[PDB]
Structure 1
Amino acid sequence: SKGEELFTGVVPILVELDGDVNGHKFSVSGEGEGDATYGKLTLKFICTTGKLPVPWPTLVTTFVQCFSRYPDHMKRHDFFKSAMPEGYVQERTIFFKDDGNYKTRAEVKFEGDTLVNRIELKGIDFKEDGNILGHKLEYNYNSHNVYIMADKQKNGIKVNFKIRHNIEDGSVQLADHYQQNTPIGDGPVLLPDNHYLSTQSALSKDPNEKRDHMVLLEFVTAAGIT
Structure 2
Amino acid sequence: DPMVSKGEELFTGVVPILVELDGDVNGHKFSVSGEGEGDATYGKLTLKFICTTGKLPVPWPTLVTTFLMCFARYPDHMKQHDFFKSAMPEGYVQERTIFFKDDGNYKTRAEVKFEGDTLVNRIELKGIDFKEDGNILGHKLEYNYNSHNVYIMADKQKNGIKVNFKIRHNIEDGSVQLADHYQQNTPIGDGPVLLPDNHYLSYQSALSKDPNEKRDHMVLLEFVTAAGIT
User: Which TM-score band (shorter chain)?
Assistant: over 0.9
Tell me by how many angstroms 1:129 deviates.
1.0
Pairwise CA distance, 1:118: 0.1
What residue number does 1:69 align with?
73
1:81-119 deviation digits (Å, cap 9, x = unpaired) = 000000000000000000000000000000000000000
Query: How far 1:222 sits from its partner (Å)?
Result: 0.4
What is the CA-CA distance between 1:31 and the residue it aligns to?
0.1
TM-superposed CA distance for 1:126, in Å, is 0.3
Per-residue deviation at 1:2? 1.8
1:12: how far off? Answer: 0.2
By how many angstroms is 1:4 displaced?
Answer: 1.1
1:140-187 deviation line (CA, Å, top 9, x unaligned) = 000001000001111100000001100000000000000000000011
CA distance in 2, matches of 1:164, 1:220: 18
Q: Distance in 2 between matches of 1:68 and 1:221?
A: 5
Q: Given the two structures, how large is their TM-score scaled by the length of structure 1?
A: 0.99
- Alignment partner of 2:167 out of 151, 163, 168: 163
Out of 46, 49, 55, the residue aligned to residue 45 of structure 1 is 49
CA distance in 1, matches of 2:74, 2:100: 29
2:121 and 2:161 map into 1 onto residues whose CA distance is 18
Distance 2:167 2:108 in 1: 16
1:96 aligns with 100
Using the TM superposition, give the Cα deviation of residue 70 of structure 1 relative to its aligned residue in structure 2, in angstroms. 0.3
* 1:53-81 alpha-carbon deviations (Å, 9 max, x no partner): 00000000000100000000000000000
Percent of aligned positions with the same letter in both sequences? 98
TM value normalised by structure 2: 0.98
Structure 1 unaligned residues grouped into runs of 5+: none
Post-superposition shift, 1:9? 0.3
Bigger mean CA deviation after superposition, 1-10 or 197-206: 1-10
| Unmatched 5+ stretches in structure 2 | none
SS in 1 for 2:47: strand
Hey, what's the Cα distance between the residues in 2 that align with 1:5 and 1:187?
17
Aligned counterparts of 1:83 and 1:4: Cα–Cα separation in 2: 10
SS state at 1:3 partner: helix
Task: Compute the displacement of 1:35 (Å).
Answer: 0.2
What's the RMSD between the two structures over aligned residues? 0.4
| Structure 2 counterpart SS, 1:7 | coil
Counterpart CA distance in 1 for 2:76 and 2:143 is 34
Output the CA distance in 2 between the equivalents of 1:37 and 1:168: 36
* Matches of 1:105 and 1:22, distance apart in 2: 17
* Alpha-carbon distance in 1 for matches of 2:133, 2:213: 28
Which sits farther off after the overlay, 1-10 or 68-77?
1-10
Deviation at 1:191, TM superposition (A): 0.1
Task: Name the CA distance, whole Å, in 1 between partners of 2:100 and 2:74.
Answer: 29
Number of residue pairs matched? Answer: 226
